[PDB]
Design a protein around this ligand. Sequence first.
Ligand SMILES: COc1cccc(-c2nnc3n(Cc4ccc(C(=O)N5CCC[C@H]5C(=O)O)cc4Cl)c(=O)c4ccccc4n23)c1O
Length: 488
Amino acid sequence: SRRWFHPNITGVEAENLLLTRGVDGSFLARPSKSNPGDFTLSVRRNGAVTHIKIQNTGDYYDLYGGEKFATLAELVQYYMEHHGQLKENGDVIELKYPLNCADPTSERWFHGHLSGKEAEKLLTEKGKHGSFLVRESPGDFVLSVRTGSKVTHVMIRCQELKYDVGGGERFDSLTDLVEHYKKNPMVETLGTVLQLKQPLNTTRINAAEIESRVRELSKLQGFWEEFETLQQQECKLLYSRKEGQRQENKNKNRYKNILPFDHTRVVLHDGDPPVSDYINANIIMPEKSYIATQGCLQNTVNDFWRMVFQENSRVIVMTTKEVERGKSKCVKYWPDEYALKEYGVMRVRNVKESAAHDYTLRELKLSKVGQGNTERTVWQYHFRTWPDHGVPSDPGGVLDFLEEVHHKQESIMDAGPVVVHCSAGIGRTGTFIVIDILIDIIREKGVDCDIDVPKTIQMVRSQRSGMVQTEAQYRFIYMAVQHYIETL
Ligand SMILES: COc1cccc(-c2nnc3n(Cc4ccc(C(=O)N5CCC[C@H]5C(=O)O)cc4Cl)c(=O)c4ccccc4n23)c1O
């Protein structure tokens, strides 16, 4: 589980939680209050609490004295499985016991302040057999289910810090109660089974009414509460990343612990006749395809081109500068303008470069060496103006770029997936892919369609780890879709 994350606690509350209710090896994670956008990993080690900083400017989670990761669940799973890796002075910190949160705020089914009539309305319009929710009653709670068709309300009593349905077991949290009756459903006298199948959808909005949702999420924030509910669903996305762990593939990853899922990785068949099949790249299939990948390493430039050629990709979206903050984000994998270069068995020519305000377009020609008939044009769209930290203050530039990328891809008959990359290939990459997926819904289906932003992100996140990194990018995605519909 992801119960070790406590969204609404202070460093003091965290210290007292570990020192009174935990042991040596106990830990929890929490958002930082001192600098929002950041996280803190509080660990109990020899009767004392250590608070460790986790940073995310949009590319990955960067734990002080540790490594860079795609999700907090990936970070926690790693350090709990691989010991001696986390260090203070250099003292080996061990994560042994997650100290669980009882706060139901980040749960999909928790609604807090809500009326039984409004809960009945939502379950009537947006609900199906098994749809349920938990809301505040006088210090008590209410479980409202849909069965068909009807709505049943079950009182949840709060007696001396424990929860019950009026008999049987007394739970230490609403989640323990909810989970219990999910596995062991309450049966009504006349045989009705109160099936807790799925939480009620609170995120799907009609495209045309996005402005109303943006306003509502901008009220004390709602964006933060919505994002942290999506974040909580990331414990379901811990798929294997075994291939990316192989000795032979270690130097093929830009970040040691940010790996591609095995079930979606782009497998390379070109094959020089040992382990010629790996690239830190994943296929992104909506519900037009993409490949989400990292910025090239000097040793992966060749694999990059074997992939572009294999997949029949005709468009590349680069969302980083080669160098940001004095650090190399992506090596130059393309030739200089008018030059011709050989990258292993692959040959590329930079025919022409066009510089627009927010980006450069490079017309590339790709072919396999010794076969002239294999030649195809690859359009490289390189976004140059993304801030080193955070998101652009206005989404127009990104929307204009994405519009051009869209129409180029659309004009090319039988073009393979769109290649999208930044540094790690999870934050800016995930942001551009998600904006593009949602704005494609409003392209085909028009302003009258239904859009569900965290449903889309979760779907993309099961395909590559940590796709869309921060709450800032998440807000940017809302702001981008809203600007598209406004200019429609
Ligand atoms: C259906 O579920 C799944 C089924 C099968 C595999 C996985 C799976 N895939 N990745 C991981 N990781 C990430 C990871 C692991 C190792 C290294 C690594 O470099 N190695 C290798 C040499 C030294 C060692 C080391 O660094 O100590 C780096 C990373 Cl990021 C974990 O932690 C992990 C921990 C508990 C269980 C599965 C894990 N799991 C899985 O999720």
